[PDB]
Amino acid sequence: IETPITANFREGLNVLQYFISTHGARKGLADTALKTANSGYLTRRLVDVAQDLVVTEDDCGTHEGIMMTPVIEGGDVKEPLRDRVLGRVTAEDVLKPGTADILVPRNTLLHEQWCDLLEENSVDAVKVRSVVSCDTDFGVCAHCYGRDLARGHIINKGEAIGVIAAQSIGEPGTQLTMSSIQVKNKGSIKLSNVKSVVNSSGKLVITSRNTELKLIDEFGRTKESYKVPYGAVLAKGDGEQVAGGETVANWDPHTMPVITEVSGFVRFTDMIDGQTITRQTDELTGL
Amino acid sequence: VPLDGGRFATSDLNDLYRRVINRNNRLKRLLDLAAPDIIVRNEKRMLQEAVDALLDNGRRGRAITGSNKRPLKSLADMIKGKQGRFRQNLLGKRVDYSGRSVITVGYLRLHQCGLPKKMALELFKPFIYGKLELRGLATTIKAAKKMVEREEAVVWDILDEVIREHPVLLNRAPTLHRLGIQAFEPVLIEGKAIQLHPLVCAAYNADFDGDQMAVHVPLTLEAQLEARALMMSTNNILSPANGEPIIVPS
Amino acid sequence: IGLMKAVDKFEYRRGYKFSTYATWWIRQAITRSIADQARTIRIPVHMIETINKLNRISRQMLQEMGREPTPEELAERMLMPEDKIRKVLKIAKEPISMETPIGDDEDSHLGDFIEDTTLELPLDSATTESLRAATHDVLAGLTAREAKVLRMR
Amino acid sequence: YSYTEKKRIRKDFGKRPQVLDVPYLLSIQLDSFQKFIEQDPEGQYGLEAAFRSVFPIQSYSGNSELQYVSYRLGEPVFDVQECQIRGVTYSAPLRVKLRLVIYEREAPEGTVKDIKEQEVYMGEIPLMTDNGTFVINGTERVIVSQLHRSPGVFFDSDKGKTHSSGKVLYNARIIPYRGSWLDFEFDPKDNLFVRIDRRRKLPATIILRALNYTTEQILDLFFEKVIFEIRDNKLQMELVPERLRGETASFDIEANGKVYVEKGRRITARHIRQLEKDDVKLIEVPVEYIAGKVVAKDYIDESTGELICAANMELSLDLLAKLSQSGHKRIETLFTNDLDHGPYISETLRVDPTNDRLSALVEIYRMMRPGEPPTREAAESLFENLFFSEDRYDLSAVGRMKFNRSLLREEIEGSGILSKDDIIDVMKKLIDIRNGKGEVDDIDHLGNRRIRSVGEMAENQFRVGLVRVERAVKERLSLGDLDTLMPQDMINAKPISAAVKEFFGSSQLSQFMVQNNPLSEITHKRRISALGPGGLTRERAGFEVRDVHPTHYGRVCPIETPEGPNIGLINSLSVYAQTNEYGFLETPYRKVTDGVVTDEIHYLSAIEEGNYVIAQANSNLDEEGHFVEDLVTCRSKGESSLFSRDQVDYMDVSTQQVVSVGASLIPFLEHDDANRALMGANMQRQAVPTLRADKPLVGTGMERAVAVDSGVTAVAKRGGVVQYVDASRIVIKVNEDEMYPGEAGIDIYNLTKYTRSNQNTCINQMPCVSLGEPVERGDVLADGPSTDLGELALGQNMRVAFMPWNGYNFEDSILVSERVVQEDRFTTIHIQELACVSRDTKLGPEEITADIPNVGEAALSKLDESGIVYIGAEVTGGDILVGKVTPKGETQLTPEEKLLRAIFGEKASDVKDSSLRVPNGVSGTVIDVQVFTRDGVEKDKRALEIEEMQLKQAKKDLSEELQILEAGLFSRIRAVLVAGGVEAEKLDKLPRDRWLELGLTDEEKQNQLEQLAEQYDELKHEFEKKLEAKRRKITQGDDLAPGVLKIVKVYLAVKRRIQPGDKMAGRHGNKGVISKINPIEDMPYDENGTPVDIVLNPLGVPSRMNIGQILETHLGMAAKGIGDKINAMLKQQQEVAKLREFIQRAYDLGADVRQKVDLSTFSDEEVMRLAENLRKGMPIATPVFDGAKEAEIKELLKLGDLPTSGQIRLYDGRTGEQFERPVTVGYMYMLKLNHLVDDKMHARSTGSYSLVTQQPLGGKAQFGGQRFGEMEVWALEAYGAAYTLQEMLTVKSDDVNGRTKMYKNIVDGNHQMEPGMPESFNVLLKEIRSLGINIELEDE
Secondary structure, eight states: OOSOOOSBTTTBOOHHHHHHHHHHHHHHHHHHHHHHHHHHHHHHHHHHHTSSOBEEESOOOOOOOEEEOOOOBSSSOSSOHHHHSTTOBBSSOOBOSSTTOBOOSSOOBOOHHHHHHHHHTTOOOEEEOOSTTOOOTTSEEHHHHOBOSSSSSBOOTTOBHHHHHHHHHHGGGGGOOOOEEEEOSOEEEEEESOOEEEOTTSOEEEOOSSOEEEEEOSSSSEEEEEEOOTTOEESSOTTEEEOSSEEEEEOOSSOOOOOOSSOOOOOOOSOOBTTTBOOOOOSSSOO | OBOTTSOBOOOHHHHHHHHHHHHHHHHHHHHHHTOOHHHHHHHHHHHHHHHHHHHOHHHHSSOOBOTTSSBOOOTTTTTSSTTSHIIIIIISEEOSSEEEEEEEEOOOOTTEEEEEHHHHHHHTHHHHHHHHHHHTSOSSHHHHHHHHHTTOHHHHHHHHHHSTTOOEEEEOSSOOSGGGEEEEEEEEESSSSEEEOGGGHHHHTOOTTTOEEEEEOOOSHHHHHHHHHTSBTTTOOBOSSSSSBSOOOO | OHHHHHHHHOOGGGOOOHHHHHHHHHHHHHHHHHHHSSOSSOOOHHHHHHHHHHHHHHHHHHHHTOSOOOHHHHHHHHOSOHHHHHHHHHHTOOOOOSOOBOSSSTTOBGGGSOOOTTSOOHHHHHHHHHHHHHHHHHHHTSOHHHHHHHHHO | OOHHHHHOOOBOOOOSOOOSOOOOTTHHHHHHHHHHHSOOSSSOOTHHHHHHHHOSEEOSSSSEEEEEEEEEEOOOSSOHHHHHHHTOOOEEEEEEEEEEEEOOTTSTTOOTTOBOOEEEEEEEEEOOOTTSOEEETTEEEEEOEEEEEOSEEEEEOOSSOOTTTOOOOOEEEEEOSBSOOEEEEOOTTOOOEEESTTOOOEEHHHHHHTTSOOHHHHHHHTOOEEEEEEOSSSEEEEOOGGGOSSOBOSSOEEOSSOEEEOTTOBOOHHHHHHHHHHTOOEEEOOSTTTTTOEESSOEEETTTTEEEEOSSEEOOHHHHHHHHHTTOOEEEEEOOOSSSOOOHHHHHHHHOOOOSHHHHHHHHHHHHSTTSOOOTTHHHHHHHHHHSOTTTOBOHHHHHHHHHHHTTOSOOOOOSSOOHHHHHHHHHHHHHHHHTSSOOOOSSOGGGEEEEOHHHHHHHHHHHHHHHHHHHHHHHHHHSOSSSOOGGGGOOOHHHHHHHHHHHHHSSSEEEOOOSOHHHHHHHHSOEEOOSTTSOOSTTOOSTTTSOOGGGTTTBOSSOOOSSTTTTTEEOBOTTOEEOTTSOEEEEEEEEETTEEEEEEEEEEHHHHTTSEEEOTTOOBSSSSOBSSSSEEEEETTEEEEEOTTTOOEEESOTTTTSOHHHHTSTTGGGSOHHHHHHHHHHGGGBOOOSSOOOOSBOOSOHHHHHHHSOOSEEESSOEEEEEEOSSEEEEEEOGGGOOTTSOOEEEEEOOOSBOOTTSOOBOOEEOOOTTOEEOTTEEEEEOTTEETTEEOOSEEEEEEEOOOTTTTSSSOEEEEHHHHHTTSSOEEEEEEEEEEEEEETTEEOEEOSOOTTOOHHHHTTBOTTSBBOTTOEEOTTOEEEOEEEOOOOOOOOHHHHHHHHHHOOOOOSOEEOOEEOOTTOOEEEEEEEEEEOTTSOOOHHHHHHHHHHHHHHHHHHHHHHHHHHHHHHHHHHHHHHTTOOOTTTTTTSOGGGGTTOOOOSHHHHHHHHHHHHHHHHHHHHHHHHHHHHHHHHHSOOOOOTTEEEEEEEEEEEEEOOOTTOEEEOTTSOEEEEEEEEOGGGSOBOTTSOBOSEEEOSTTTTTTTOOHHHHHHHHHHHHHHHHHHHHHHHTTTOOHHHHHHHHHHHSOOSSSOSOOOOSTTSOHHHHHHHHHHTTTOOOBOOOSSSOOOHHHHHHHHHHTTOOSSSEEOOBOTTTOOBOSSOEEEEEEEEEEBSOOSGGGOEEESSOOOOSSSOOOOOOTTTTOOOEEOHHHHHHHHHHTOHHHHHIIIIISSSOTTHHHHHHHHHHTTOOOOOOOOOHHHHHHHHHHHHTTOOOOOOOO
């Protein structure tokens, strides 16, 4: 509604203002009164499949597991590597940015001290042991799972993981009822999987879809991630150490080009008029 | 079975069995009556329909209704669905040695819950009988029953230490996550409502506006050990979902 | 079944239409069927025909007076002692169900409000065990001959 | 003002003048039932309509028929009092007088051969109480009105249902009042289909051909014509200029001498204007422009008469050549288009396989009755009965009116049977909607919803009963006697009565009325529902039927509804809401006559409201002039805007019409969020009457109206002077201005003493008037259960401070003082009834006696020699109220018990203890013991004592009635003798008996004397007959259920106090529970010494959005300050005139308050009583949206000598120091809710067990244990305590020999557990095995 309630509770309301607010009030009551049943059904379905996930071993001695990365993509770093790996166990000999400096013999309990040691360094990716990667039959092993959250130590055998996990992810169910690229901070611009090419003005432009923009800090870890489409125009090259607040990448939201990576004469080939193409000319420019 | 008002009430399975046996013996008579084959085909059709209705009434054709024009509950309906034996009688069951009350706030310690005296003797009544027998103040069990019916001072003398060091489980429907069940050490209070330590309220997502509470008591020694070592509120500080505390003042 | 039973009883030399004779047989058959069957607790035909007569008489009485038929008033048309009508009324109890929605939804069936009045209370079992132990020890406290003769008696 | 208004005047703060008084709150029920009862020969509503809808009914041969002549309701056999005493429905008999007309075929019109006219009996109709309720089986029940989709035609659309296209599939529906529906549905391929009762879809051409419709006329009615001519050489078309709507020129359009649009070019509107200007119509077209068009007529060659081209056929050039050579130069074709005229009917004809009426009817029969072969006569008979038989189809006047209005017709009245024109117009409108011309209406618009009261359902059920009757009369007429078949013998009354009784009590809309408060009565009797028959269910409810439609303004309150699953399904009509004759909700409004707001009131319904523009009640009129602002905030077309002075057409009648009665009670409602206002209005209905009624200080002005409208108080019908007051009866002598010249004119008001409610609460009436004072018409005489001097009083009011006290108010909790418990402010009274039943078991009849085995005489000391507890004797839980023994059957004894029998010699005889016992936790006093005994069996001496007490009471009360009647009848009986000469020297001197033998005179006085003798004979033979009838009805036996001999009902009254855990609440949704009872000295107290008795958490105000409670607190403090000053000065008695001056100065504080109360018209006693009445604090009034602002309360508290801020400093009573900041201390109106603690208390150790599965039962009342639900099993197994859950589901509920051993060894001091297979698993195994699937337990 474009007519707001200009008054407040202290000054009282008009009859029509209260009537309008009753819309939102009743809708808010309605969604709460309805969707809790879907929440309960979700919890039941979740815990049904999580019946028999119980620890059977401590360590199955499996191979490497899952690579881990922060969530810097899209916007600001929301969850850093500090908390996303706190409580996990590595799957390979992770080494510091200084080569041949290893902190883990392919498995260790990443408590707060190891986390501080790694965040002091410029590490940005670690191989950690996952539940899915576990090789144990009819169960999972503790070292493939990680330390407990209720106690803080490594999980001892006997308890059930499926039921607690399903309850954990089902409890908040009732609470969740409802053209240009500008760099924000100083860093080095890196291109991920780039098919670079040089435009007519000598700048750097892109000819692929699988390229990403990365902001590398002084340490080496990426700070920001952004998406650049195919056939876009960039105002900067790769490996440029630039400050924030500059429009670096430009592309038309609608016009998708077919830009040619090579240079040479352009004669109309395979262009037969009257069978595949139509003769239309711009009525203002003529080109 | 008979009712108090001189009437009777029975399961519709009786009606289904009566119908099937009636048309079964009717077909038995018709077979040796050498009736025309049309009537035999009709009787066989209705025999099949009746047995299908018995196995699953509202499955193959029109559901066979009773005197109250309602569909009859076949034995399959008793084994499936939310109302089947699996969900409301096998997984979740009614339980004994329990009580229900209203919740209220308390000065209590973190591991203490205010249990009113009136329900205390009712819950631990078998324990009172046993302790009174061992203490020698009651010659026979029914004498102890009379004594607890008379609520003499001796029964409270027994209560003050029978409940001591004997945890009691507390539940608040609905139980969303693991923290919905908490073991507290009982403390006798002279009132009617269950007194609750305020800090645990956020754990229960419970507010003191008339919400009801359920109390259960463990019997065997293993149950008491599990309640004390695992289910005590002191053991539960951090969420299983994530390691942040749950006892933050509200 | 009534029709096929009546088939042989018909005679063309009687000079009547078949439907007239077959109607009585089929009616008697269906009345017999609704008599024996169609009731959980079977009742002999005499009582059901008497209750049908009672229903007809009650309809006739409500036709004129407009009030319910008093058993003392019903005695005038029944021409029988007033105990018999009450005995007939006692039989009119029709079993209902175990699953009538006694509350409001399909969650409170009548089958969950019936108590098993055939099991002894655990208090009774405890008292019986205590009584057994007491009898054993008190008999052990008597003379062997008296104890054994009492036990065999 | 009325005289009782002088007793206590509630100061108001309303500013805008009050133009329309609130209507009677229960008109909806009373008017609806009057429409169902009254006999209207010309109007067809109620019984007459139902009778005339079926009657007359003729036989199959037509040789006989029944004619309904008249009907009548006999007087009720029982009054409501003994109706609810005896547990019988308060009903009345029905007597219908009818005729028999008999025809014979020997004469062509031998109608006059035999006529049997007489009055027969059938059915009993429950009546309506004068309060507007029903009494069924001795219980008070109410029927809530229903809201349902109106009958008629509706159009709907689809939003994203067709995922493939995203198109909108419009559809039409014909919904009759009763009978089969009809549905027209579109398709993604643009085809029309028909559906009958949600069945599968058939093309609309089938329903078209079912009506003797040729393809030609079908496409003529559904299309226009394009004309083709052949001028012997070429093709010529008559062009309509308004048909080439921006299309593309397939060919080069020319004219007589001009060319307009070239090929492959859009036709501009300018070319259309040119074609209009030159007026050229005939244009030549090539063959290609014709290729693709469909002929609209069958064409043959008359040379041989064989078909050349059938109808609805797309022609080609060869077909055109054949037509030309056959001599047909005049052709007509369908006019197709992409935007305005789509050929949907053409494609529907293409899909249609049927070719004539017989095929269409065959397909219809196959659809309706699959498998059964059709015949030549069955199909059209079924088709006619579907929509063309009066008995099996009906639209009613409302449905016909809506159907006609939706089709733009001018007729209002019509036929309830569909015609070809109706469905054709429906299809045409649907096609127009599909094309674009028109719009699709809305479902939940209040113009498309209809309200249905009790009377309509009652008449529908009576119609059902009449149909059941006709289903047998149709055979009785054709097979019964022709001359001696008296009607009364061949009509059965059981089915109609059975159906009507089933509706009254076994239906969904009839239920036990809530009886806690008068407010609850009003809000439940004024209820709108959308459930039950013909309505929705909570599972099938989405969002469109739950939210607030903009048309709800003024018709349905948006603030009151249950907050459970049925939020949008149960509502209540507004304060001023009414009902049209068709059953639509309409509201009043004030007409605006060229900027002048006239006081005449119009009534506008939902559909017409959108046409005009309505000014809200917030504008101000300048002394019958115009508004204050040039632009005024108004509403129209379902949205708000601003409009000039002359644009507005109507004005709101009052500021309160948007909310309901229940929500209007909340003061300062406009300052609270809707969320909390909703729950506050809901919980305001859970109040429990206290020992005494306490007037709310911060009211709203609606209490004095709802109190008298609920009918629970004693209202005086006629004014007069109070003559006699007692605790139970009131007698008033009415003034001579109301004297009917024939009778006494002295009325009686018999109050009702303590009586049980439907929620086990006490009901009492106490007189609020004194001896020898006047009373007016429509004025109050005695207060109700929760009323104070004609004003509603739900709860109490007391001090309150907002200060966090030691955590005892941690989460909305309530801290309470000992003083309020000392003075019994919240003390309540509960009345329960207990039933002891004696039956005749086959082992022997049960007998009630004072002789019971194995019981102490101390318990029996409260019983008489008949075995019934004495009246007024106190009782406690566990005692015996009545001693009942049943013949014990033959029992089996073990050796030990019979060994004891031998040892001690005692023998338990054929007796079993079945005596009634007081339920545990109940301590109270016996109020009444009511015993009924079956006729035939002798009655006990206690029954004799009850009967003789009732007899003497009846005799005394009837004699009192007669003496009071004659005390006023003498004013004529004596005065007629006084007429024609007074003889006071001898008339009055002699006793009245010697007044008939006065001085003899002419024959006129002799006629007077004989008339008076007849009057005295009437007096003699009117009273004794009633006395005999009463005596014989009391001595009459009582009908009871078969198998019982006598039944004893004992009423027990329990006095209930406040316990920690009780549910306290306010009027703003701020509820909580009592945490601790606190001694007086420990409570905070001000420097004046008065301690506050209620302490509330302050943090609960801001986030809860309820600020109005703070204003209410300040207002209450100001009112109590004024009252405190009044009583303080009253103790010294300065001057009556001084009190008058102070009270006059108190009542004029508002800037433009409505009332101007003057005390100069009052007397000294009148102001003395007034001051005494408001001695405890003068009440205040506040309309919901006309509330007093902050300045008014500031001024009021300035008058009361209180701090301006409204907060004062307190001293802690524990240690005696002031708090660092002032604390808001005031007076607030607190409620007592029925959510108590003891009635929620329960604890089970070892009790009953079920039958099929032997689990412990559930429910406090039957002493069953809690359900160890399914989620806590998940939690416990998540913890890992296997043993605990093993005990929970093994040894607690489902082990017959497990729990017994557990109990035994627990008593033995050994808490060892022994497991076992659950019994509910054995029952599962046996059931699944009996199902026919093999199952075994695989042993090792």
